[PDB]
Structure formats: C-alpha cells, structure tokens
Point group: C2
Chain length 368, copies 2
C-alpha cells in the first residue's frame, strides 16, 4: 500500500506546483527519478495527469465528484471536477424538509449532475459526498440551542439512507470538515499544510488541518468549533443566560446576526433579506460583529493552544462585505492580545464561500 | 522505510499484549505470518524481544535511556529501561540555577546513570532526553506570569548546549509532551490510542495523543494547556485581574495552590511543606481545588471540542490525596455539564506522577 501513498503525494505535490517536471517531482517530495517515473506512469494509466523536459499537471477532467450540502435553509448539490471546478449546481433555498423528502430531492439532482457528463466521461464520476452539520441532540434542541427543523433528523444517517437509493457510492462528512477539505485541496492548503478553518454559517463550524490532513477525531467529532464554552452574550437581543457558560454557536453564528437584526425591527426571512441588511451598513451588523469577535478571539486562542498552527482561515456563508469586516475586527483582536499569547497566527480569507461544503463533500468520493 | 514502521507497530502491539505468539501478532495488526516472522527476526537481531506455540515479549533490558527533567524547583535525571522501569535517579530539590551550572550538574548525573549499567550493557543506552516547561518569554515574565528563575533561560537551547558536552545524543521535548509520552508508551496508552493528558505541576501542562502519537505541532507548541483563556480567579489570594481574561496557568497550577496556602498563614518553602499542608486536610486546599476545577472544566471542554478524544488522563506533581480529590471534583463537574456537551469522556488517574516527565524524556532516545 506504499504505492498508494506515493501516488497521493505526487498528486498533492503537483497541486502545490501546478506544472512540474519528472526531475522537479524528484526534488520536491525527495524521491528517486526512477520511482516518480513509475508513479507518473501510474497516474498516466489512471488518466489523472496530462501535459502542461516535459511538464505534467493534474487532469482536471480525470475524475468527478458530486457533493451534497444540507443545512437548515439550503439543500445543495454540485458536480465538481478533479481541479475543484464546479461544473454544475442545483441549490434549493428552502426550510430543510424531513429526510424522506430530501432523499427524493437529492436523488433527482444527482441525476441532473451525472447527466451533465458526456457518455464517454460519466465513468470518471467517483460518487457522492454528503456534508451536514452536527446534530446537537434532542435535549439541547428542546432547550433552544438548535432549531426544530433538525427534530426529524436526529439519529438518522442520511448518507447511508441515500446510498441505498443510488448506485453511486455515498460518503458522509461533517460540513465544517468538508469545507476545510475544500480549502485543504483547492484553496490555501495548496501552500499550507497546517491551519485552523473557521466557517461562519447559519451555525458556526470548522475543521482542523494537521500535516496536510483534516483531523476527524475518534468519533468524527473533532473540530467542533460550535461547542467551545464562551461567556453569555451581552447583546440586547440575546436571550437570558442558561448558566455561567454559553457555547460559541450562540454568539458567532449568522443566526445570532439574524436574531440581532430582528431586534432592531428588520424583517429577515430569506438570505437575500440578510444580504440587503449587511449592504445597508446598519450599525446592528457592527454590534453583532463586535460581539461575535468578543466570543471568537478567546475561543480561537484556546484552539491554537491545542493545535499550534500558524495560519487561521476564515470564511462565511454570506458576504456582501460581512467577511472582510469580520476579518479586520478579528485580526485586530488577535494583535491586541498577542503579548498575552505564546504565538499568534496569520489570518486569511477563505477561498470558496457558500460553495465550500459542497465542494468538499464532492472531494470525498474522488480520493478513496 | 516501511520495514521501520512494521517494526515499531509489532513492538507497539507487543506492549499492548505483553506476550503474544507469531500467529497472534498476525491476528492483531492484520499482518501476514510470513512478514511478522521476518519482523520478529528483525527484533531478535536487535535484541529487542525475548521469550515469555512460542510467545515473545519485549526485552526490558534491550535498550536504555536517560531522561532529564528541569523545572523551577527540580533538576532530575533518571535511567529508564525499555519497559519503562526506572533503574536509577538523581533528584535535586533546588531553585533552578542558571543554565551553565545545570549543565555541570546534569553532566555528572548522566555519568552516574550510565555507570549503573554493566560494561556489556552500556552499549544499549540510546542517549539523553531533556524535558522542560515552555518559556513564556520576557514580556509575560515581567508582568508576573512566570517566575524570575526563568530569566536566565530565555532563548537558551539547553538540549543543544548539553549535547555539545556529552557524547551521547541529546533530544529535547516539552515536559507536558514528555509526560504524555510516558503515559502513551507505558501507561494508559498501552490500551488507549487517543487521549488528552493533564498534568498539574508547579505550572500546569499537558499533551495530546492522537492515533497513538503525541501531537507536537508545527513549532513544537501543541498541547499548550497552560495558555487557554479562563476567567480571572475569584480566590481571595489571587492578584487583581490584568483584564477580562486570564490563562489556565494562573489558576490550575500548584503554584496557585501555594499562593493560596500562604494566604491562610501557612509557610510553604519545600515540596514537603506543600505535602504536609495537603495531608492536614486544610479547607484552603479544598477552596483551591474548587477554583482549579472551575477553570479546568471549561478549558478541558474547549480541548475536547478540538480533539474529540474519549479519555482524559489527569496526573500531578504532588499527591498525598490531592490527585484523587482533584479527579473526583473534575469528574463531578464534567457529569453536571454533560447535557450541554456533545460527548463526555472518561477521566482516569495518570500512572507515573512526579516521575512522568523524566520517564518520557528518557523514552525519546530509545525510539529514534
């Protein structure tokens, strides 16, 4: 199985270099010219590489994956190629229905994606990845921490239930990890093997890149950014506290922003309502940003104490300026508390935005 | 280099099993009977295994390591064998002198340890490991967070300076990682590959076991338990707060306990003073325990959010009952906040106590 690893590494090195030569792929990865020649030849019979001394790059159309991303107000399905290009997408902005209905919706949308490939190319489609948030469970849902939408989804394995209605093989991943995986393979991870990935969605989520691989955990629950203890919000729109500690989810998620926007009389029912408010420069957004960062900087410091990565990547489900504003304020809060930390990382903007989880979900089938 | 890995794994599997057979070492680790036969034969020529179908165990005297553990009030040097037995130790209960004096102290003590091995066995001595706390740096020292003892040690690489006066090869490790490494190789890690390791010393420290390996980090700074943000102490003996956040170090370290004991009129100058106070059942110890746990339970929850390990190991530099008392209270605090977490780990008492860092420091030379 050591030939399987030397092929993934040669590929990973080509991603970092774009186009490299036989001799270059010896220099990097510190391999013998005889053995990368035999590895290049392995990737060539798999139609995974192509010509750019002769230089080779990955073949963008050498494999395909379909990625499904479920969330409280979004069912999304995307056809992604080997270079991470999104070649097709069906996005439903709807309150997440019961799992039975979603299987039917996703199955049809999986059919429209595979049918975007010509007959002579559908064979390169590796399968389907499903990305979805952690379920907090019944007790925390009925206490107010998670919407009633997820009630029909507790102790329901959607990826398995989907795999028994489609012939393609189905892989499941948490959506924070899936978005980190997109950044690892096609985004900042092409030049950086260690980082903390923060994603501000309806719920906040995240993932942990160590040594070029996404940390998943013993039970698939590593990187659970949403659950880190923080102090209760002091925003007027926050509910009363349930005790001395809250969780990062309550404060640094777009849902908290929507809750705060409604507190100042705004109506927010679609994502387009949310974007319109952000684009109006309302002070209520800045108040939420300050409160968000006030929770997220200490929570992130805790994470950096555990992991010791030099880079933090921040992305979000909604922009219209929101993300740059979050990045500036969070960077300022790190710089102002840097003397009290042993190291302080670089903060970079994520690459894929709302499309991250679907792209990362699509990657799973292509690399296994 | 795939034969180097298959040997470390066969060894790691023997640690877990004690004595196993050729056929057993095939069952476990899922290897071929032909290939573990060739691996057993590799360990036999290295005199690393011995007889307990014929059953084999590791050879306790097949290798040796010397481990050095530096701390603010302790210079310690131990001869450790391949099974983790401590065969010799020189422990100096003294205020940590400048690095120049310590090199001279440790060099003589390294000489007394190697001289405990008979001539025909000194060849199995792999070298020296040095374990020492993270240095907080000048700015945090002069703000009160670290004792003036460490001033002569900032930006001083002790392991390298020691290696240039001894012929043995010298490896350096942080002392929290080193103690985790002892637990990983000889303690709870013989049956458990994933865990968070907490060590209550003069300063608190720790380490992170993932997939059977100690997480070290990009810059050697992973597992920095001491730096996790916590709220300022409300103990009468704590200083005023420096801002809204403190660090776990200020509250969950034995130094905070000593500070609190002095606050109730006790004199504490040696470790024996500290143990006498704990054995008297003074309420001041229970107050500190409550405050310690009040900081450590949220900090640990944060860590578990990142790592997702099912077990937490807790050990301490001083016992006399202190450790069982800390474990009971911390376990109670986890159980009482379990409904607010997505998983809750088992809490176990560490195996090695004050001897952990030296044993883990000694392990480094034997496994490289």
């Amino acid at each position: 199985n050591v030939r399987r690893y030397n092929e993934r590494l040669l590929l990973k090195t080509l991603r970092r270099a774009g186009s490299a030569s036989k001799a270059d792929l010896a220099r990097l990865a510190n391999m013998t010219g005889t053995a990368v020649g035999s590895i290049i030849a392995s990737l060539a019979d798999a139609k995974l590489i192509e010509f750019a001394a002769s230089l080779i790059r990955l073949d963008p159309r050498g494999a395909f994956g379909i990625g499904v991303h479920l969330d409280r107000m979004r069912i999304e399905t995307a056809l992604v190629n080997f270079a991470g290009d999104v070649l097709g997408r069906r996005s439903h902005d709807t309150l997440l229905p019961p799992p039975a209905e979603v299987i039917e919706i996703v199955r049809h949308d999986i059919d429209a994606m595979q049918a975007l490939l010509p007959a002579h190319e559908r064979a390169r489609l590796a399968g389907v990845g499903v990305a979805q948030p952690y379920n907090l469970g019944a007790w925390m849902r009925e206490l107010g921490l998670a919407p009633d939408t997820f009630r029909a989804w507790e102790d329901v394995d959607f990826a398995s239930d989907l795999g028994r209605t489609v012939s393609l093989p189905v892989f499941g991943e948490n959506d924070g990890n899936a978005a980190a995986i997109a950044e690892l393979f096609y985004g900042y991870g092409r030049q950086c093997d260690d980082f903390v990935y923060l994603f501000i969605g309806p719920a906040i989520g995240g993932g942990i890149a160590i040594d070029g691989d996404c940390l998943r955990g013993v039970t698939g629950n590593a990187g659970d950014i949403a659950m880190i203890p923080v102090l209760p919000s002091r925003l007027a729109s926050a509910p009363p506290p349930r005790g001395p500690w809250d969780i990062l989810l309550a404060r640094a998620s777009l849902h908290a922003l929507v809750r705060h926007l409604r507190h100042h009389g705004e109506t927010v029912e679609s994502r387009a309502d949310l974007e319109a408010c952000i684009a109006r420069g309302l002070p209520a957004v800045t108040e939420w940003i300050d409160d968000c960062v006030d929770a997220l900087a200490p929570a992130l410091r805790a994470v950096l104490c555990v992991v010791d990565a030099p880079v933090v990547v921040l992305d979000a489900d909604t922009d219209a300026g929101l993300l740059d504003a979050l990045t500036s304020r969070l960077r300022a809060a790190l710089v102002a508390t840097a003397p009290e930390a042993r190291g302080t990382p670089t903060l970079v903007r994520g690459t894929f935005g709302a499309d991250a989880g679907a792209i990362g979900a699509a990657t799973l089938p292509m690399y296994f």
